[PDB]
Symmetry: D2
Subunit: 280 residues, 4 copies
């Protein structure tokens, strides 16, 4: 049994189950618009771990949220905790990529009694926004909502065009293909990339810089952070300075933002860091 | 001869109840009530404001409005979207807001986020939310996550007798009997025991992320339209020197009136006192 | 002295309904059921005249101010029967009576024949059995139902710029002007162009599976309680003259009255006529 | 290169799960499983039907498809509507049905009601539902309504042990391998172990049965060729009314040794069903 629905009171999520049932409890959280197959290459190289690779709401094969509900970061955080409860987990670890890493940091800092450790791939804090611009951002969010019912879902008459659509938005062909297998939905024309139109909405309220700094400082468990030298630190070198103020174990590795999925090579690089980490 | 007075308003994500006051050609006003109250909050004030088309909206989870769907939150800017969507569904471009307590706070958020849309703000004994700083936000989100896990356990009181239900609404001068009776007519629901104050258990939840003090101040300083704020002499705001110091730096017109937090509902004289301010304000 | 509760939500597990409450809390418990596309104000003239009774004038799902059913749910006659039974459970009612007009009378009979230990009495207004269909046409009928379900996304609801054009629209659905007005107060919803008769597009769908004539007659035979039937001279018997003979085979009390199908709502005289019948019947 | 095998199909009112089998350009077939089963019911059969594009659909409330919304029914013609909407979502106008048990009953209803859409029926040990006449209909409606009131109270069993949950599946007759195949798509994790993911409303009795005349009228309105596989000693095969009825029908019958789940119990049983249906889809 490697593929299940997990029924929470408010939503039903999909998950793929990796590793043995006696292994260390881990939930694996993927990035924006991705899904659990983000851990195709990586989950099976971390033996000793019972890895539940969760589709976030509105991604992969998990349900779309009910009408009116938001896709904010702490809504995912609540989903993940309730997945843990529904499994009977008390303490567990989080393996996170990109947005998934950000969600993991929030949970760890909000509920340090629940999180045993963090294995994070090329993600840490959200894009932030300050109080002076907040009235303005809420207004943008309110207007984007009035346009929600007119959003488009593109259609690709053939699969290969669906795969390469995903590359122009950057990953390898095998990565795109692996995501597509869990990520595509048949429509009359052909396949579309299953998603919830609300996932493109601007947030009504970003965390300030002080909020994000406080979350990251509230983490109490060990942290292993893999940084793609062609990834996030290529896009934000102010991150470098913040990372120096933190105790997290940093490993810079070749590859891009999805280094753990692009290649067997990247995945094996990531796996060796995390296998070490999970063993101590 | 014909007057539609009670309606549903269909938003794409929720269906709300509203009571309509005034001539269909009056200045457009949406009235927003307080936490765990309902449209009858305005049952004495709205008839007294006779140039105005007042849409007295029940907020989600309140009065006769639907509860939100499973998993949806009840945050201030959730109400703000709903209110805006009500204006859309009514075909309103520009409109004014009349708000009591929490409804005043939602009004201020809306006005500061969408200055182009809000003509006027008439606020009763509310302005800014309770705020929380970033140093406690992680602990606050932990509390919210835990409260969500424990939400299953809460239950709603049942009153076998209606007078018991009104009496539970007053619990020694915070709200009058007449005020609790008016609210009770739109706020109670028959159950097997008798009556319950119709509500959503999720309205109990703590916010996962409070606005910071800086956030609250930026919203109130982004209000560009005329504002008339009425403060209850026997409420908390008119007593908070931190409120006085704030209002003194803002252009909002201010009036204090005898009475409690529900002064516009408690009796005719209060409603008329408040009417006198807002009727002059709207007549400009 | 105390203000009483007249308008409420009634929370069922799967839907939330609206009802208007008439009469003394200790009155004989009655649920009043209206016709297709009408609503609880179908009983606005008649209920106040039934002095002994505690009448819960229910909005059916998708009508008046009750919620529409969730995505994919059907509006078959027996779905209404369940909602009515669940309403009584939510009121704590063990045994109860029914007062039904048109489709409401039909639902009442289905309920009374299916669960006779709960229905004490039926008061029926110019309704008895549904339109039926035999097995030889069933595949065709389901086929039609599947095709209509596929075409349902394209249904839209008329918009009336003018309150009075929405009322006249209802007079050609025949019914007096004051009756259309009365129903319009509970049946109209504000939309951007003005007013729409609030409804669910699914109420236009054909049944996937009609009751056979034998079904209908067995539901009628299965009624165990006393039944009072009112027959409008220009109503049901003027459309289906076969009905007169079926009725002569049933122990239902029959009262022939003037007026059309909505004789209880068209005018004060119909309501007075109908009320003296039902008031006699409910005193026994 | 890699192919899409597991998918979500979005209908306006509900979201279903399906496994896709066979060549993209195959003869279009939607495969329909039986009561309380899922698409793993075809795990053995469908790979053996090589010319066919088989959309093995989880019925609402089963397998990995979503449960219906609050208040919605699980009646045979709600499944029929779903199957039709899935065909629309796939862009299929004419398509074939492969149905087991209740899946076969739903398929007959669809063919009989929309002859223009159904090209063939390949039915396994299913034909018409249990019927009930008008003289019992009020009693049945009342039982259905009393069942609805009491549904609230039922809670689903929880099996601390995965194999205890499988063994529960075994109580008609079915093999351990068929049970485990179904359990891979039909079990969900729960605080105390595992539960068979199912909607409780699936246990409710119908409010309104088809009469015998309805059922007969549906089977007799099927205008397309049908291949009916019967289990040799099943109730459908031997009850004199079913044999008598079936003798009057233009359907291609084949009685085969095996249980109600003969297409799933064992590879041998699947091969046997494959041969029949393979030939039938070739003509």
């Amino acid at each position: 049994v490697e593929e299940v629905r997990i029924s929470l009171p408010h939503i039903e999520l999909a998950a793929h189950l990796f590793g043995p049932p006696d292994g260390k409890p881990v939930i694996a959280l993927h990035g924006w618009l991705d899904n659990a197959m983000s851990f195709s290459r990586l989950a099976p190289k971390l033996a000793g771990l019972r890895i539940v690779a969760l589709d976030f709401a509105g991604h992969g094969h998990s349900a779309h949220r009910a009408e009116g509900a938001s896709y904010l970061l702490w809504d995912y955080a609540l989903d993940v905790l309730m997945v843990a409860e529904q499994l009977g987990w008390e303490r567990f670890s989080l393996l996170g990529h990109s947005m998934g890493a950000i969600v993991s940091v929030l949970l760890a800092g909000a509920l340090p009694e629940r999180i045993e450790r963090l294995a994070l791939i090329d993600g840490l804090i959200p894009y932030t926004g300050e109080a002076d611009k907040a009235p303005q951002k809420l207004g943008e969010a309110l207007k984007a909502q009035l346009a929600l019912r007119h959003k488009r879902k593109p259609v690709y008459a053939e699969l290969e065009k669906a795969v390469e659509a995903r590359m122009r938005g950057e990953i390898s062909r095998e990565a795109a293909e692996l995501l597509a297998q869990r990520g595509l939905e048949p429509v009359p024309g052909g396949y579309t990339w299953r998603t919830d139109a609300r996932l493109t909405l601007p947030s009504p309220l970003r965390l300030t810089q002080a909020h994000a700094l406080n979350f990251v400082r509230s983490v109490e468990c060990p942290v292993s952070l893999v940084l793609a030298e062609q990834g996030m630190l290529a896009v934000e070198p102010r991150m470098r300075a913040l990372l120096e103020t933190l105790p997290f174990e940093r490993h810079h590795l070749p590859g891009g933002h999805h280094l753990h999925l692009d290649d067997e090579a990247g995945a094996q690089a990531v796996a060796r860091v995390f296998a070490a980490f999970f063993a101590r």
